[PDB]
Amino acid sequence: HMLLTTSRKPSQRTRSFSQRLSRIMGWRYINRGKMSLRDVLIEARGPVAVVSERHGNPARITFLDERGGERGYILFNPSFEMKKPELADKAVRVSSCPPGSEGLCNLMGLEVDESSSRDAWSIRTDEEYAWVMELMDARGTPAGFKLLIRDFRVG
């Protein structure tokens, strides 16, 4: 459902993160090289997400519609282990979006699925972050991949 890319000249960590996330989501990943956003949108022919950084860390995901309108954005810090997540499917499901988190689900195109928590996201509150989005793997246990959400805005 989406093309993912990064801001221009990303660090190794931003690359690793974004390649990982796009695999998890089943989104098509492209190297940003030296393209403008306009040229990214031409290549995508469809919606795009851009992972941008501050100080060499991924810090924001911006979501665009196919014409380049900004759907919204998420400010976050990633938390991921070295081991590849074990997934049997695109992680396009979420177990629940509690009140106040619906925009996370809308931006990322997640569908609520109460039948199982495998290959799925869990959204919860945290003492430090606004939300933690944690990937549950093909066995429904923590995949070692989280989005630590500081804020998000839609529209």
mmCIF file of all heavy atoms in Angstrom, residues 129-152:
data_model
loop_
_atom_site.group_PDB
_atom_site.id
_atom_site.type_symbol
_atom_site.label_atom_id
_atom_site.label_comp_id
_atom_site.label_asym_id
_atom_site.label_seq_id
_atom_site.Cartn_x
_atom_site.Cartn_y
_atom_site.Cartn_z
ATOM 1 N N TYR A 129 6.706 8.041 26.828
ATOM 2 C CA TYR A 129 6.239 8.311 25.471
ATOM 3 C C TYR A 129 4.743 8.450 25.461
ATOM 4 O O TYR A 129 4.062 7.904 26.339
ATOM 5 C CB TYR A 129 6.676 7.173 24.520
ATOM 6 C CG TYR A 129 8.158 7.167 24.324
ATOM 7 C CD1 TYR A 129 8.996 6.403 25.158
ATOM 8 C CD2 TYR A 129 8.739 8.003 23.386
ATOM 9 C CE1 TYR A 129 10.341 6.431 25.000
ATOM 10 C CE2 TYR A 129 10.075 8.064 23.228
ATOM 11 C CZ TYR A 129 10.882 7.268 24.033
ATOM 12 O OH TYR A 129 12.214 7.303 23.827
ATOM 13 N N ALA A 130 4.223 9.167 24.469
ATOM 14 C CA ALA A 130 2.761 9.243 24.272
ATOM 15 C C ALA A 130 2.140 7.841 24.042
ATOM 16 O O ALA A 130 1.124 7.475 24.650
ATOM 17 C CB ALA A 130 2.433 10.178 23.100
ATOM 18 N N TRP A 131 2.776 7.076 23.160
ATOM 19 C CA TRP A 131 2.381 5.724 22.799
ATOM 20 C C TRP A 131 3.620 4.895 22.512
ATOM 21 O O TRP A 131 4.646 5.421 22.035
ATOM 22 C CB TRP A 131 1.511 5.745 21.523
ATOM 23 C CG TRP A 131 0.281 6.609 21.668
ATOM 24 C CD1 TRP A 131 0.107 7.876 21.178
ATOM 25 C CD2 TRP A 131 -0.926 6.277 22.367
ATOM 26 N NE1 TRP A 131 -1.136 8.348 21.538
ATOM 27 C CE2 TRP A 131 -1.794 7.391 22.259
ATOM 28 C CE3 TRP A 131 -1.368 5.142 23.056
ATOM 29 C CZ2 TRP A 131 -3.079 7.407 22.825
ATOM 30 C CZ3 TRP A 131 -2.656 5.148 23.608
ATOM 31 C CH2 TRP A 131 -3.497 6.286 23.490
ATOM 32 N N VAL A 132 3.530 3.596 22.792
ATOM 33 C CA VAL A 132 4.487 2.622 22.266
ATOM 34 C C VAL A 132 3.748 1.651 21.318
ATOM 35 O O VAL A 132 2.722 1.036 21.711
ATOM 36 C CB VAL A 132 5.225 1.856 23.401
ATOM 37 C CG1 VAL A 132 6.115 0.733 22.829
ATOM 38 C CG2 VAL A 132 6.090 2.839 24.243
ATOM 39 N N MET A 133 4.265 1.539 20.091
ATOM 40 C CA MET A 133 3.752 0.619 19.103
ATOM 41 C C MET A 133 4.750 -0.501 19.025
ATOM 42 O O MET A 133 5.889 -0.301 18.607
ATOM 43 C CB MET A 133 3.633 1.251 17.720
ATOM 44 C CG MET A 133 2.606 2.327 17.625
ATOM 45 S SD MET A 133 2.490 2.950 15.790
ATOM 46 C CE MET A 133 1.716 1.413 14.971
ATOM 47 N N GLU A 134 4.317 -1.676 19.440
ATOM 48 C CA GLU A 134 5.193 -2.815 19.504
ATOM 49 C C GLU A 134 4.740 -3.903 18.534
ATOM 50 O O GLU A 134 3.573 -4.288 18.505
ATOM 51 C CB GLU A 134 5.211 -3.372 20.905
ATOM 52 C CG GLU A 134 5.835 -4.738 20.987
ATOM 53 C CD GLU A 134 6.547 -4.928 22.285
ATOM 54 O OE1 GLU A 134 5.993 -4.489 23.316
ATOM 55 O OE2 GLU A 134 7.664 -5.497 22.266
ATOM 56 N N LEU A 135 5.692 -4.395 17.764
ATOM 57 C CA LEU A 135 5.430 -5.458 16.821
ATOM 58 C C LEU A 135 5.377 -6.790 17.562
ATOM 59 O O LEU A 135 6.282 -7.113 18.354
ATOM 60 C CB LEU A 135 6.517 -5.482 15.729
ATOM 61 C CG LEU A 135 6.381 -6.530 14.621
ATOM 62 C CD1 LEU A 135 5.057 -6.322 13.933
ATOM 63 C CD2 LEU A 135 7.547 -6.423 13.621
ATOM 64 N N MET A 136 4.296 -7.540 17.319
ATOM 65 C CA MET A 136 4.160 -8.898 17.783
ATOM 66 C C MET A 136 4.485 -9.793 16.599
ATOM 67 O O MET A 136 3.988 -9.575 15.498
ATOM 68 C CB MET A 136 2.731 -9.173 18.262
ATOM 69 C CG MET A 136 2.226 -8.262 19.393
ATOM 70 S SD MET A 136 3.493 -8.142 20.903
ATOM 71 C CE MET A 136 3.016 -9.668 21.896
ATOM 72 N N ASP A 137 5.300 -10.817 16.826
ATOM 73 C CA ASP A 137 5.746 -11.666 15.715
ATOM 74 C C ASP A 137 4.760 -12.796 15.352
ATOM 75 O O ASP A 137 3.634 -12.850 15.872
ATOM 76 C CB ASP A 137 7.173 -12.199 15.950
ATOM 77 C CG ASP A 137 7.273 -13.134 17.127
ATOM 78 O OD1 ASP A 137 6.259 -13.780 17.521
ATOM 79 O OD2 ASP A 137 8.403 -13.227 17.663
ATOM 80 N N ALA A 138 5.193 -13.689 14.464
ATOM 81 C CA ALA A 138 4.347 -14.787 13.961
ATOM 82 C C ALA A 138 3.853 -15.729 15.051
ATOM 83 O O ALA A 138 2.989 -16.565 14.799
ATOM 84 C CB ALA A 138 5.092 -15.580 12.896
ATOM 85 N N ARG A 139 4.419 -15.618 16.251
ATOM 86 C CA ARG A 139 3.977 -16.433 17.376
ATOM 87 C C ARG A 139 3.190 -15.592 18.391
ATOM 88 O O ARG A 139 2.791 -16.091 19.444
ATOM 89 C CB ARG A 139 5.172 -17.099 18.050
ATOM 90 C CG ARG A 139 6.037 -17.857 17.068
ATOM 91 C CD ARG A 139 7.261 -18.495 17.712
ATOM 92 N NE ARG A 139 8.116 -19.093 16.679
ATOM 93 C CZ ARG A 139 8.150 -20.386 16.379
ATOM 94 N NH1 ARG A 139 7.385 -21.247 17.047
ATOM 95 N NH2 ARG A 139 8.953 -20.822 15.408
ATOM 96 N N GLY A 140 2.987 -14.321 18.064
ATOM 97 C CA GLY A 140 2.314 -13.379 18.947
ATOM 98 C C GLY A 140 3.096 -12.980 20.187
ATOM 99 O O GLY A 140 2.501 -12.583 21.194
ATOM 100 N N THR A 141 4.418 -13.096 20.134
ATOM 101 C CA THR A 141 5.284 -12.582 21.199
ATOM 102 C C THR A 141 6.099 -11.384 20.651
ATOM 103 O O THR A 141 6.171 -11.195 19.432
ATOM 104 C CB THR A 141 6.229 -13.678 21.741
ATOM 105 O OG1 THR A 141 7.059 -14.151 20.677
ATOM 106 C CG2 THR A 141 5.443 -14.861 22.325
ATOM 107 N N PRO A 142 6.675 -10.550 21.537
ATOM 108 C CA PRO A 142 7.345 -9.319 21.088
ATOM 109 C C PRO A 142 8.483 -9.565 20.106
ATOM 110 O O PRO A 142 9.364 -10.382 20.371
ATOM 111 C CB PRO A 142 7.872 -8.712 22.395
ATOM 112 C CG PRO A 142 6.881 -9.222 23.423
ATOM 113 C CD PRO A 142 6.709 -10.661 23.004
ATOM 114 N N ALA A 143 8.444 -8.855 18.976
ATOM 115 C CA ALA A 143 9.377 -9.083 17.863
ATOM 116 C C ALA A 143 10.751 -8.436 18.066
ATOM 117 O O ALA A 143 11.701 -8.714 17.307
ATOM 118 C CB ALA A 143 8.764 -8.564 16.575
ATOM 119 N N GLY A 144 10.859 -7.566 19.069
ATOM 120 C CA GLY A 144 12.050 -6.748 19.233
ATOM 121 C C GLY A 144 12.080 -5.571 18.274
ATOM 122 O O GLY A 144 13.134 -5.267 17.700
ATOM 123 N N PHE A 145 10.921 -4.947 18.065
ATOM 124 C CA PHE A 145 10.798 -3.792 17.175
ATOM 125 C C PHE A 145 9.662 -2.878 17.629
ATOM 126 O O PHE A 145 8.472 -3.248 17.552
ATOM 127 C CB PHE A 145 10.615 -4.235 15.708
ATOM 128 C CG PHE A 145 10.735 -3.104 14.702
ATOM 129 C CD1 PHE A 145 11.926 -2.893 14.009
ATOM 130 C CD2 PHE A 145 9.646 -2.253 14.438
ATOM 131 C CE1 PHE A 145 12.019 -1.867 13.070
ATOM 132 C CE2 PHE A 145 9.751 -1.223 13.524
ATOM 133 C CZ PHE A 145 10.934 -1.019 12.835
ATOM 134 N N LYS A 146 10.025 -1.677 18.076
ATOM 135 C CA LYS A 146 9.056 -0.732 18.605
ATOM 136 C C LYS A 146 9.228 0.641 17.994
ATOM 137 O O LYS A 146 10.336 1.056 17.639
ATOM 138 C CB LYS A 146 9.189 -0.552 20.119
ATOM 139 C CG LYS A 146 8.982 -1.774 20.938
ATOM 140 C CD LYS A 146 9.651 -1.577 22.290
ATOM 141 C CE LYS A 146 9.294 -2.663 23.264
ATOM 142 N NZ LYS A 146 9.852 -2.384 24.617
ATOM 143 N N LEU A 147 8.108 1.344 17.913
ATOM 144 C CA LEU A 147 8.090 2.760 17.620
ATOM 145 C C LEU A 147 7.674 3.484 18.898
ATOM 146 O O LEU A 147 6.587 3.256 19.421
ATOM 147 C CB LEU A 147 7.143 3.064 16.459
ATOM 148 C CG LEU A 147 7.270 2.198 15.198
ATOM 149 C CD1 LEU A 147 6.262 2.698 14.154
ATOM 150 C CD2 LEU A 147 8.679 2.275 14.590
ATOM 151 N N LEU A 148 8.580 4.329 19.405
ATOM 152 C CA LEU A 148 8.365 5.053 20.636
ATOM 153 C C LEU A 148 7.857 6.428 20.241
ATOM 154 O O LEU A 148 8.616 7.288 19.813
ATOM 155 C CB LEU A 148 9.662 5.110 21.468
ATOM 156 C CG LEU A 148 10.381 3.736 21.651
ATOM 157 C CD1 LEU A 148 11.670 3.853 22.418
ATOM 158 C CD2 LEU A 148 9.481 2.742 22.384
ATOM 159 N N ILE A 149 6.554 6.608 20.360
ATOM 160 C CA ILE A 149 5.892 7.748 19.737
ATOM 161 C C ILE A 149 5.873 8.909 20.708
ATOM 162 O O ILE A 149 5.317 8.813 21.794
ATOM 163 C CB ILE A 149 4.441 7.386 19.314
ATOM 164 C CG1 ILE A 149 4.411 6.095 18.449
ATOM 165 C CG2 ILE A 149 3.731 8.577 18.673
ATOM 166 C CD1 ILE A 149 4.876 6.256 17.081
ATOM 167 N N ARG A 150 6.494 10.001 20.291
ATOM 168 C CA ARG A 150 6.470 11.248 21.017
ATOM 169 C C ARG A 150 5.217 12.065 20.733
ATOM 170 O O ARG A 150 4.685 12.711 21.636
ATOM 171 C CB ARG A 150 7.712 12.074 20.649
ATOM 172 C CG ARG A 150 8.978 11.666 21.438
ATOM 173 C CD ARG A 150 10.018 11.027 20.516
ATOM 174 N NE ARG A 150 10.760 12.040 19.744
ATOM 175 C CZ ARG A 150 11.884 11.809 19.075
ATOM 176 N NH1 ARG A 150 12.394 10.600 19.035
ATOM 177 N NH2 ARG A 150 12.500 12.791 18.429
ATOM 178 N N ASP A 151 4.738 12.037 19.492
ATOM 179 C CA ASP A 151 3.596 12.880 19.114
ATOM 180 C C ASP A 151 3.194 12.417 17.716
ATOM 181 O O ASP A 151 3.980 11.733 17.030
ATOM 182 C CB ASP A 151 4.062 14.357 19.152
ATOM 183 C CG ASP A 151 3.002 15.374 18.714
ATOM 184 O OD1 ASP A 151 1.783 15.079 18.656
ATOM 185 O OD2 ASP A 151 3.422 16.529 18.423
ATOM 186 N N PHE A 152 1.981 12.765 17.299
ATOM 187 C CA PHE A 152 1.602 12.607 15.885
ATOM 188 C C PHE A 152 0.490 13.574 15.569
ATOM 189 O O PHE A 152 -0.306 13.933 16.441
ATOM 190 C CB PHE A 152 1.151 11.170 15.567
ATOM 191 C CG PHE A 152 -0.203 10.806 16.164
ATOM 192 C CD1 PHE A 152 -1.363 10.998 15.444
ATOM 193 C CD2 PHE A 152 -0.301 10.293 17.462
ATOM 194 C CE1 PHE A 152 -2.611 10.682 16.004
ATOM 195 C CE2 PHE A 152 -1.535 9.985 18.027
ATOM 196 C CZ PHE A 152 -2.686 10.178 17.306
#
